[PDB]
Write an enzyme that holds these catalytic residues in place. Sequence first.
Site, PDB file in Angstrom:
ATOM      1  N   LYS B  67     -46.693 -14.723   8.473  1.00 51.54           N
ATOM      2  CA  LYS B  67     -47.300 -16.121   8.817  1.00 51.54           C
ATOM      3  C   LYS B  67     -47.342 -16.585   7.557  1.00 51.54           C
ATOM      4  O   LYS B  67     -48.956 -16.359   7.229  1.00 51.54           O
ATOM      5  CB  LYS B  67     -47.599 -16.520   9.573  1.00 51.54           C
ATOM      6  CG  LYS B  67     -47.597 -18.082  10.107  1.00 51.54           C
ATOM      7  CD  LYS B  67     -48.686 -18.085  11.699  1.00 51.54           C
ATOM      8  CE  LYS B  67     -48.756 -19.980  11.411  1.00 51.54           C
ATOM      9  NZ  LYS B  67     -49.885 -20.784  11.777  1.00 51.54           N
ATOM     10  N   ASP B 155     -51.423 -26.886  22.079  1.00 45.95           N
ATOM     11  CA  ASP B 155     -50.340 -27.643  20.829  1.00 45.95           C
ATOM     12  C   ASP B 155     -49.978 -26.261  21.495  1.00 45.95           C
ATOM     13  O   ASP B 155     -49.188 -25.658  21.091  1.00 45.95           O
ATOM     14  CB  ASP B 155     -50.118 -26.863  19.131  1.00 45.95           C
ATOM     15  CG  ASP B 155     -48.622 -27.171  19.101  1.00 45.95           C
ATOM     16  OD1 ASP B 155     -48.024 -28.140  19.942  1.00 45.95           O
ATOM     17  OD2 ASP B 155     -48.140 -27.343  18.007  1.00 45.95           O
TER      18      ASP B 155
END
Lengths: 332, 332, 199, 195
Positions: B67, B155
């Site tokens: 990432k 989230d």
Amino acid sequence: SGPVPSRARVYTDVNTHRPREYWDYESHVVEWGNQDDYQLVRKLGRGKYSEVFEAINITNNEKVVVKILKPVKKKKIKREIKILENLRGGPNIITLADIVKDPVSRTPALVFEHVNNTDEKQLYQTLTDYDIRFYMYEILKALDYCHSMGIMHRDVKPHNVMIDHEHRKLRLIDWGLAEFYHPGQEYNVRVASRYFKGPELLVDYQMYDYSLDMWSLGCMLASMIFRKEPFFHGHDNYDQLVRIAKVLGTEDLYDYIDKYNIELDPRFNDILGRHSRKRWERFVHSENQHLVSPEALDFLDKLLRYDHQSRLTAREAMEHPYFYTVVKDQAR
Amino acid sequence: SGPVPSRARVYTDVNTHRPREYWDYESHVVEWGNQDDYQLVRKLGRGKYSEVFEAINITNNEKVVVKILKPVKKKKIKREIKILENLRGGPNIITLADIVKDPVSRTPALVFEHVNNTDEKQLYQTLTDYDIRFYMYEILKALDYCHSMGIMHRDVKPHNVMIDHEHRKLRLIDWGLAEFYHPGQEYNVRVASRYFKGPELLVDYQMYDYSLDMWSLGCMLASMIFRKEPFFHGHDNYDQLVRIAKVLGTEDLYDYIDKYNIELDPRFNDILGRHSRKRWERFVHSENQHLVSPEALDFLDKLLRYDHQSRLTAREAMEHPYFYTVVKDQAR
Amino acid sequence: EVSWISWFCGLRGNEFFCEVDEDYIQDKFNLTGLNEQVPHYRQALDMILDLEPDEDNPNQSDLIEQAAEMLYGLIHARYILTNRGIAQMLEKYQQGDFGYCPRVYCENQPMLPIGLSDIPGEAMVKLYCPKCMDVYTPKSSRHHHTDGAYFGTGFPHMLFMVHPEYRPKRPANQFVPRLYGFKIHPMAYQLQLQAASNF
Amino acid sequence: VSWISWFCGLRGNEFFCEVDEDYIQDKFNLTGLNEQVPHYRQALDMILDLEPDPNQSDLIEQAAEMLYGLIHARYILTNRGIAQMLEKYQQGDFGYCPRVYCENQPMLPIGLSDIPGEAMVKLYCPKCMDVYTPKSSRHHHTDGAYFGTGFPHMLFMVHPEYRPKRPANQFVPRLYGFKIHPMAYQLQLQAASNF
Ligand SMILES: [Zn+2]
Ligand SMILES: [Zn+2]
């Protein structure tokens, strides 16, 4: 008019009695091998007709020598290939291993078996007296063999003798100027190298033979034993005969062109003069005297003669006392 | 005037009683690894904050997920690293394997252990009733664990749930918005994703908690069982509340902003109107009815409530009848 | 008349640049960290966005202009890593705007701009051939003054990560050295290199 | 001004060296070339600035140019030719290698084929040992056969001291710092294959 005809004292008719396609090189069909067998390693040398590289065979991996031949008349290429093959196997003669071609430009190359020569120049500088005798004998083996097979080398010189001094191995190389001997034939006087050209070439006498090679072999011997290279150091082809005449004397030279009724170049008249035959002892000095003996001088004297017919044959040369000590050791 | 304060019904004080450096992420010193251990293979995805590639750890030839994090305040980067580390090991939480940096530009990247996901399309549309139950349970395990470790994900949405359907393996990913819960703290209402934003965020009520995650999990469950995605499909953040209000009814909404004395943004004035609470049976039709049961609808109804405090906790949810059949299989 | 971005990318030498969208620049989040890299950031951004300037100092206006060019460049390097940037650069590549590979056996493969370093000042822009996968100096000298850092070390690598279908096949053929038809054995090079080393 | 001197002086002909009159006047060097050029006799006359005797004058001029080219290809393989070309290489007349990691290594002219008509002159870099197209378009009309497949190879066979070391550095693709694994190109070629 007409110059007197001449013929070789030995092997005069070896070619007459062979099937034509022994000496008819124009009719030789070349069998080509696979070029991709050979890959180049380094450049070995070069010259007026060829470029030469060391290479490796990939079939089994051993070195070879590849003589890449620059554009000439196909005639000349066949001539060399035929002679290389005719003499292949013979004593001290270079083994032609294969013939290959660049499919595209069709540039032909000769592949020879590897010869590991010794700094040849840097070799001489310390050749001993026995060494010169030994190697000279080995040249004569090749020269007698090739003459016996009806071929004259026509370019005997040190660059065309490979010496593996470590293994006492010698090989007479570069047959790009060799030609078949046919009695009666008028040959090209434009052969050899200006320092190794025999008188017969310098006076434009064309009916020469194997004996031409013996003059050249003389010029080599003289160079090695007197330590003067080249021995006859002419500035042009005319001057070359002057340099010879200064040693051998102008007597035997005018006797020679009378004996054979040779039309001299009018230009030779005007530079030759009058010179005495000098004694071979005269070129002896401290640096060379260890290489000079009486047998050496006798041998040389019987090689360097204007009359090609009075020069030793390669077989006769081998019989000289100069090699007695060699032939004895080679009686094992 | 001023809003009524709030507190989580569970794990209210887990952070109070831990050493600062558990929750003080600004003071976390990141230990960097060797970037040259990782080499990229293909792009997997992207985000506002990051670019994601599958890679291979050349030290032992394993797949990883890298990432790569685009420039943000370092504060946020440490926050994600701390959380990822605090939760590492826990059930269905993504394993952070390593952290690396571009020595030159200094672009930091998170390295995670490989998760073989399959894509929305092949999955949700085509899941069975048991499948939804099974996976919902697994999300609850992660959600209960991260809450218990004093962290709200903030989230939760389908893009942040990895499903390896082949191995029935689930991972709750992307903690770039997760934050520590501290009772009394006013948080940023700009979190989540419009469709998954809880009412508390949409009315600018800041003293929220873990319950926010339960609202989002509701929106997911609704989407999966009714086969409508996203479930609450608002055009902007204000409209988003109207879409919710058309389902849950405007009472319980005005009751909610009264209970907590929340100052409604002047542009909600004439927009909300008056809507009745619609029965959940109302969204059931032929395409979805095989996923809808009474237990499912009760469960959903106890998750999607305006009052964050009346929503099930992740542990309470696990106790619901909806999962009885799963919990039973889990115990063979 | 034309916009600053439109002008800049239109300049001789700037043929490798695409025009960055105003959306992208107006979104502060995309330029995070760039204020720490260009002098006169505030005024430089204002120029790029064709906004009211602040003109009495004739050299200060040229100092801002340089900063505007540097910032544009640095933005560009980020922009072309994004889906839309790639989309625009890919358009330019399909037209051959970046020139073609000089390697004979690459058969004029269109190339992409690449930076050998991401730090400005360190090297000018080079070209990346996706067939032989090596890096070349631009043929035209007008490209010998465009900073590589304004394209970045990762652009072409990203582009093929995103559009792997654009990656050309590796060259069908290779150069084979022949002299008079003979291939050159590889021993011929050790040999040679020694002669240089011995020298 | 000598024809040879003019020809090598033309725009585009920057790769040619000036062949010695000795070399041409020696028939032995031009063996076989009469079978390759139309109007050989007259072409040779033009090249040597000799007495000539319409569009025919242009036809000869082409043949002169073709024969000069083919002579050149033999001439530069010789010690003296190499010597001249080596002089031009030491000045960088043939251009420089565009490969970034070759660091502007001066190149040598090479032909990809020895037959005229097949391909234009290319450049050989002795550092990366690969072959490049000339950057300037004026050289895209000079026949490769007028230099030959063997020129650079011979030059280093004769002057091995002139061979540069292999490049100390290589290009390493990095994305955000990360190297690209070789299995990224394999997958990328697979994707392109399916389209
Ligand atoms: Zn290429
Ligand atoms: Zn190179």
